[PDB]
Design a protein around this ligand. Structure first.
Ligand SMILES: Nc1ncnc2c1ncn2[C@@H]1O[C@H](CSCC[C@H](N)C(=O)O)[C@@H](O)[C@H]1O
Length: 231
């Protein structure tokens, strides 16, 4: 089952086109769901955290963290999605080109609490963005092409400070029922990618089977939230 979607891809241009065409869906209404349920364990009572959001889209959580005094950085290939974030969140921003990455740009809120890099996550190393106390990964790992898991994991690990908390959600479903994204990422895969370098705790497993998965054609859907910290 783990290899069923192994050769399935969406390309960077495919993702940009989903945004252009409005063929992208955001079923996230109050933010996420198990978002706030575990925010306290994630923050571990600290202030002024530097928090990275891979494949951030226009995630409202980025504004929640910024509102609370944390420094937020996101990466998102779609310029359209990034601009929608600032619009939806009613925030002004600047645009600057990225020297190290052809055609790339960074969009930053006017007082700097949110910086959204418009480029591929795989190009981020060249942008010299430093490291992070926290990484928030909802939808990102499960959006990555299965073939690119190791490349993604390596980048994630390279962006972590020595002490960190990395919150990552994965989805369990029958991979023969649905060609991703989101892709099927079993616990075994999360372990393969991060277990050498991170301690792993399952915080919660919930039954996520609902409405729109009627045309997805799924008999079951579980989402598991994991908290990864230094070994
Ligand atoms: N390699 C890549 N680098 C940067 N962004 C990517 C990417 N591959 C996909 N994306 C973007 O990643 C997002 C994946 S969908 C998840 C969006 C967000 N994490 C949320 O839950 O709200 C899309 O907005 C897509 O345009």
């Amino acid at each position: 089952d783990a290899e069923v979607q192994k050769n399935q891809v969406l390309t960077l241009e495919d993702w940009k086109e989903k945004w252009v065409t409005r063929h992208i869906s955001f079923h996230q209404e109050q933010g996420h769901q198990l978002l706030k349920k575990h925010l306290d364990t994630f923050l571990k009572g600290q202030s002024g955290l530097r928090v990275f959001f891979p494949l951030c889209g226009k995630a409202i959580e980025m504004k929640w963290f910024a509102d609370r005094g944390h420094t937020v950085v996101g990466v998102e290939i779609s310029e359209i999605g990034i601009r929608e974030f600032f619009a939806e969140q009613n925030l002004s921003y600047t645009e600057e080109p990225l020297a190290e990455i052809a055609g790339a740009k960074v969009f930053k809120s006017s007082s700097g609490s949110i910086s959204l890099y418009c480029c591929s996550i795989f190009d981020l190393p060249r942008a010299n963005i430093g490291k992070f106390d926290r990484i928030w990964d909802r939808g990102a790992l499960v959006a990555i092409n299965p073939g690119d898991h190791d490349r993604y994991a390596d980048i994630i690990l390279s962006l972590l400070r020595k002490e960190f908390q990395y919150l990552v959600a994965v989805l369990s479903y029958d991979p023969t029922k649905h060609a991703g994204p989101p892709f099927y990422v079993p616990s075994a895969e999360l372990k393969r990618l991060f277990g050498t370098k991170c301690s792993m705790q399952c915080l919660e497993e919930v039954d996520a089977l609902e409405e729109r998965h009627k045309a997805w054609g799924l008999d079951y859907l579980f989402e598991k939230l994991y908290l990864l910290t230094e070994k």
